[PDB]
Amino acid sequence: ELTVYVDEGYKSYIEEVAKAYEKEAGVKVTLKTGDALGGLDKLSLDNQNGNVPDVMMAPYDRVGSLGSDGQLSEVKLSDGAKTDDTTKSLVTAANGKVYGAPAVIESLVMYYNKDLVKDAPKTFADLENLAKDSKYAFAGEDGKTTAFLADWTNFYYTYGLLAGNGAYVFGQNGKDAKDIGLANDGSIVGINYAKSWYEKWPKGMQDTEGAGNLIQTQFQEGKTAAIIDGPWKAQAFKDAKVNYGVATIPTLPNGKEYAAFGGGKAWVIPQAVKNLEASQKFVDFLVATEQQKVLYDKTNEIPANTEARSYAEGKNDELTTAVIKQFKNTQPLPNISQMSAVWDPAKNMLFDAVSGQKDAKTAANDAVTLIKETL
Ligand SMILES: OC[C@H]1O[C@H](O[C@H]2[C@H](O)[C@@H](O)[C@@H](O[C@H]3[C@H](O)[C@@H](O)[C@@H](O[C@H]4[C@H](O)[C@@H](O)[C@@H](O[C@H]5[C@H](O)[C@@H](O)[C@@H](O[C@H]6[C@H](O)[C@@H](O)[C@@H](O[C@H]7[C@H](O)[C@@H](O)[C@@H](O)O[C@@H]7CO)O[C@@H]6CO)O[C@@H]5CO)O[C@@H]4CO)O[C@@H]3CO)O[C@@H]2CO)[C@H](O)[C@@H](O)[C@@H]1O
Its family? Predict the structure, then answer.
């Protein structure tokens, strides 16, 4: 009498937690598996028919947009959830009602192959030097490298590059939707720097679709020293038996930190659930210290619950350490409605600039005009 919709990578986790929740309270938790973002895309239509899962996971930006749009029930933050000021703020929409319980904090980090390299690269000049070295030449197209790869046409990925250089999405720390900073001078240096890398990379890095699969394949097959990716990738890398280390993203050519979004995920409850109390109850259990520790144990993702998070910090694995440092150098993932209009124009900006189809400034100005349109 309760259904949880999650990504495959959480199946084992939810199976175990369900088994315990059934023992503690008297509720049967059945799981439905599928694309997380895709489940949220259809939420509005599922709310129309009543056929919604009882609990699902959302990135914080989507907690804000889906919440602001009426698609989500309000969520209560129990004492057991062990939230802090920053995780509370990440699940509070502009209105500002609470539409999720914090489950994960995350930042992009640098994964590197310990079989290929002795130490973590520290600067972007280090990554550029690996580009020079010849075991990383790409077959069939030269002179291209796979020494360092990042999915820099995904705005979530590139953002930190632009922001480290002075770019911003919205003014007043992601709140002022009228002041867009994606076409400032710093943003343009970020974009131009991105371009220089695309000019050293396989043309497939510019593919309209699966650059993500190319990156993953190259790294797992021992062809790339370093990539930038999220903690969610860890389960897969362990499966691929990759001998990976994790470090903070190397400092930029300007010496500044790669200022990735300070993001993560919450447990959310669709607006159309039969029984909100029952859903809140399982959510309280999921964010309770024990289940949050088990989340770290099963996925290596960093718990939002501050007690469970200290546990992960104590475990002191390279990934947790890097996520924690990196999170100090982030600005929070914006959760105002208007963020939802940013991702697509920004992605097109990046494709157009790095391919040289538009110059960087023009691509940015065009992206900003289109974002301005949508809000
Ligand atoms: O090689 C290209 C591409 O390949 C992969 O991407 C796949 C996806 O796996 C698959 O889901 C689908 O993507 C669809 C997507 O399903 C649609 O919803 C839509 O995506 C929109 C989205 O709806 C918008 O909200 C906005 O997304 C933002 C997002 O809201 C924001 O939070 C952030 O997302 C990052 C997130 O916060 C992180 O947690 C993480 O998400 C992980 C989870 O942690 C993990 O638990 C599990 O669920 O997988 C998630 C990854 O899917 O990373 C997120 C960043 O990747 O930023 C995004 C913007 O990126 O905008 C998007 C785009 O308009 O459309 C897309 C595309 O049709 O199909 C693609 C294949 O193309 C790979 O994952 C990706 O990195 C590669 O770039």
Answer: Belongs to the bacterial solute-binding protein 1 family.
